[PDB]
UniProtKB/Swiss-Prot annotation, chain A:
Protein name stated in the entry: 26S proteasome regulatory subunit 4
GO cellular component assignments: cytosol; membrane; nucleoplasm; nucleus; proteasome accessory complex; proteasome complex; proteasome regulatory particle, base subcomplex
Residue numbers bearing the Phosphothreonine modification: T12
Subunit field text: Component of the 19S proteasome regulatory particle complex. The 26S proteasome consists of a 20S core particle (CP) and two 19S regulatory subunits (RP). The regulatory particle is made of a lid composed of 9 subunits, a base containing 6 ATPases including PSMC1 and few additional components. Interacts with SCA7. Interacts with NGLY1. Interacts with PAAF1.
Species whose genome carries this gene: Homo sapiens
Subcellular location: Cytoplasm; Nucleus; Membrane
GO terms for biological process, alphabetical: proteasome-mediated ubiquitin-dependent protein catabolic process
Annotated family: Belongs to the AAA ATPase family.
Disease implicated: Birk-Aharoni syndrome: An autosomal recessive disorder characterized by failure to thrive, severe developmental delay, intellectual disability, spastic tetraplegia with central hypotonia, chorea, hearing loss, micropenis and undescended testes, as well as mild elevation of liver enzymes.
From Swiss-Prot, chain B:
Modified residues (Phosphotyrosine): Y194
Protein name, as recorded: 26S proteasome non-ATPase regulatory subunit 2
Record PTM Phosphothreonine, positions in chain: T24
Quaternary structure and interacting proteins, as annotated: Component of the 19S proteasome regulatory particle complex. The 26S proteasome consists of a 20S core particle (CP) and two 19S regulatory subunits (RP). The regulatory particle is made of a lid composed of 9 subunits, a base containing 6 ATPases and few additional components including PSMD2. Interacts with RPGRIP1L. Interacts with CRY1 in a KDM8-dependent manner.
Underlying gene: PSMD2
Species lineage: Eukaryota, Metazoa, Chordata, Craniata, Vertebrata
Transmembrane segments: none
Stretches for region Disordered: 1-52
Full protein segment contained here: 1 to 331 of 908
Biased composition, class Low complexity, residue ranges: 10-21
Phosphoserine: residues bearing it: S16, S29, S147
Length: 388, 331
């Protein structure tokens, strides 16, 4: 609603231009007349104080044991039906003291404890679902840290980050930004790394959900979480929703699923609507990451739902060296290990294997209370990770 | 009060400047020779801002606050040589040593004499030399004088020549957004005689560059909104924007014609002798401009019809203008 700050962010002069001065003095004159305008009338008309008298009378009209209940329906204004504490419905009378605006059908209502009526709305406790996927800040991974993938970082920048920092570009050519991005590649290529990189330099509520939690126990509590996921995203202003391992909504079978595949499909048919249905969309951008782009219904990937398909290949030899350097940056090597010699250990190392080598190297140096990794540590590190 | 690393530099060359009080006796010729040569080399190392903090500037800041307060009027003698050197050190400490409420008694310190040819010194600097201080001072002293002592000596009119000089160079200094800086100073001064001051400012600015005058008109729109309570600047304020957009500027006149409507739209004395001035803008936006001025359209045909020769067609044109082209085209 209204914003307490930012009375007039007219910083267009951005200098000592006199235009800044004229507006400021305007309020000062209005303030002066208001001062004696309120106190003067507050003496010969000592009916309402507006500071202690106003609040006082309403409190008496309220009750000491204020009740809490659920508003069930909105009958004509000044009248509503509110569900009592346990199981009863009362045709209460709405009092004007309430804002009369936050009366959503089912949020909350405060009622007098004897003549039950509407006395006031109650803000709804942050539902546990919102807190579950409300990623605050990406801990450490920056955007120059990712390294390697270069032509693939421009697509994500140009779909989920540019339209929020420089909208003019998709503002003068009359082109709406590409709807979504789907990331696909072998197991371990930076798919999620780039996914959390965008969360770093972003100004929107990031939400993350893995494909495995989209499949639930009871029937119907399937394509109902999908509705909740996109209901939270809309309520939270600009937001990037990240679905990870989307290939778990029909690639993995779980006994907890009361309904079998037939139930999982209806989850997809609800996810299909939530990405492109005849409802309004607003500002919500979907990033889907998967390691098997060939095992999902070719309608979830239809242009319009997800537009830009980004392909993540196994690291190139030149990029392999960059991966080692970034991961080994904060490591006191023993000027005896050569990075180039370990670049060729197996025909194709994902890159997540590179970090595994550089992380097991340290654990192989801790065992000897040594703060310098030698070629022996890496040699045994390169065998304990990608061999067994 | 202390120095490090480069301590040697500020030690040897400072004894002579500090020896001035003791060098004025028995050494009549020593002082003059050193000053002449030091001036040339000083500017080379000053124009470059390679040091965040000025080491030399702070040294004199202390003794200059009190020494200059009583020494300046101590002599009160006009000398050809002393005046040039004296004015040099007055401007340097103004921004920092002088506090905001100190220009009340500063009228006699700067009005009496000018700093020689400081114009060259005010061109290299962008906005930090004297632009901030110069404008603020005139906003207070002048107003009080005109309240009851508007009649004064010729000194009041001397400052008029000063105003014109500044505007001629600020616009082209950088061609950046700072161009809009000039109008602020002229507004405060000459509240009543605003027209006379503006006549000189735009006389030279328009000739220097042609197209860079359009941006100026924009600042005029918002300026008039914050007018005075008294109903005295409702007519004079609306006349200034006209002369600039005349034949002295681009002949588009699209905004010129609109400018006449501000003075309550007194059509009897603003454009009544304006349509026939050009006689060659019939196909231009001249016709369209009047199409948004439904204030004196009834009397338009009173003079236009009697012409019967200024226009190729004089009867058919008027008929098809009212609503013939409005409803038919859309449907
Ligand atoms: N190209 C790369 N550049 C930098 N780090 C990489 C790269 N590829 C993998 N990594 C590292 O691999 C580690 C573990 O795997 P990672 O999180 O990157 O997997 P992923 O590529 O997103 O794959 P998946 O979708 O299978 O989870 C990450 O912490 C990341 O730093
Ligand atoms: Mg992943």
């Amino acid at each position: 609603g209204p914003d307490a700050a930012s009375k007039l962010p007219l910083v267009t002069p951005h200098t000592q231009c006199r235009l800044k001065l004229l507006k400021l003095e305007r309020i000062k004159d209005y303030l002066l007349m208001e001062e004696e305008f309120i106190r003067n009338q507050e003496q010969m008309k000592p009916l309402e104080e507006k500071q202690e008298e106003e609040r006082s009378k309403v409190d008496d009209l309220r009750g000491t044991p204020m009740s809490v209940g659920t508003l069930e329906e909105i009958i004509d204004d000044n009248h509503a039906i509110v569900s009592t504490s346990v199981g009863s419905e009362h045709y209460v009378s709405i009092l004007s003291f309430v804002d009369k605006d936050l009366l959503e059908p089912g949020c909350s209502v405060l009622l007098n404890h004897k003549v039950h009526a509407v006395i006031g709305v109650l803000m709804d406790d942050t539902d546990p679902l919102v807190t579950v996927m409300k990623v605050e800040k990406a801990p450490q991974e920056t955007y120059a840290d990712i390294g390697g993938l270069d032509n693939q970082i421009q697509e994500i920048k140009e779909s989920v980050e540019l339209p929020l920092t420089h909208p003019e570009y998709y503002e003068e050519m009359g082109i709406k930004p590409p709807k979504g991005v789907i990331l696909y590649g072998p197991p371990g290529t930076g798919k999620t790394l780039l996914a959390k990189a965008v969360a770093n330099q972003t100004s929107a509520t990031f939400l993350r959900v893995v494909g495995s939690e989209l499949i639930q126990k009871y029937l119907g509590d399937g394509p109902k979480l999908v509705r909740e996921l996109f209901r939270v995203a809309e309520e939270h202003a600009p937001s990037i929703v990240f679905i990870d391992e989307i290939d778990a909504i029909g690639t993995k079978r779980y006994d907890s699923n009361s309904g079998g595949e037939r139930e999982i499909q209806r989850t997809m048919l609800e996810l299909l609507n939530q990405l492109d249905g005849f409802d309004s969309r607003g500002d919500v951008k979907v990033i889907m990451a998967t390691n098997r782009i060939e095992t999902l219904d070719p309608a979830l990937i239809r242009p319009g739902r997800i537009d830009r398909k980004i392909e993540f290949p196994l690291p190139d030899e030149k990029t392999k060296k960059r991966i080692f350097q970034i991961h080994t940056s904060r490591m006191t090597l023993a000027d005896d290990v050569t990075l180039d010699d370990l670049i060729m250990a197996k025909d194709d190392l994902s890159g997540a294997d590179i970090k595994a080598i550089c992380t097991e190297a340290g654990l192989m140096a801790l065992r000897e209370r040594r703060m310098k990794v030698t070629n022996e540590d890496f040699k045994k590190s390169k065998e304990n990770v990608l061999y067994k | 009060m202390e120095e490090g690393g480069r301590d040697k530099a500020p030690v040897q060359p400072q004894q002579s400047p500090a020896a001035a009080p003791g060098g004025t006796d028995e050494k009549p010729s020593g002082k003059e020779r050193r000053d002449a040569g030091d001036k040339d080399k000083e500017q080379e190392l000053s124009e470059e801002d390679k040091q965040l903090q000025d080491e030399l500037e702070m040294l004199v800041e202390r003794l200059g606050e009190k020494d200059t307060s009583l020494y300046r009027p101590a002599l009160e003698e006009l000398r050809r040589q002393i005046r040039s050197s004296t004015t040099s050190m007055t401007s340097v400490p103004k921004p920092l040593k002088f506090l905001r409420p100190h220009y009340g008694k500063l009228k006699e310190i700067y009005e009496n004499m000018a700093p020689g040819e400081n114009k060259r010194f005010a061109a290299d600097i962008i906005s930090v030399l004297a632009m901030t201080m110069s404008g603020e001072r005139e906003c207070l002293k002048y107003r009080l004088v005109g309240s009851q002592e508007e009649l004064a000596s010729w000194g009041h009119e001397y400052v008029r020549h000063l105003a014109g000089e500044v505007a001629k160079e600020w616009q082209e200094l950088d061609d950046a957004e700072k161009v809009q800086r000039e109008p602020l100073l002229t507004l405060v001064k000459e509240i009543v005689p605003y027209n006379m001051a503006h006549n000189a400012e735009h006389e030279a600015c328009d000739l220097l560059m042609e197209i860079e005058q359009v941006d100026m008109l924009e600042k005029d729109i918002d300026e008039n909104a914050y007018a005075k309570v008294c109903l005295y600047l409702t007519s004079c304020v609306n006349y200034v924007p006209e002369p600039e957009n005349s034949a002295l500027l681009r002949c588009a006149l699209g905004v010129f014609r609109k400018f006449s409507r501000f003075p309550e739209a007194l059509r009897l004395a603003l454009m009544l002798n304006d349509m026939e001035l050009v006689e060659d803008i019939f196909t231009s936006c001249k016709d369209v401009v009047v199409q948004k001025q439904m204030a004196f359209m009834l009397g338009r045909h009173g003079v236009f019809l009697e012409l019967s020769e200024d226009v190729e067609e004089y009867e058919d044109l008027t008929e098809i203008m009212s609503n013939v082209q409005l409803n038919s085209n859309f449907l």
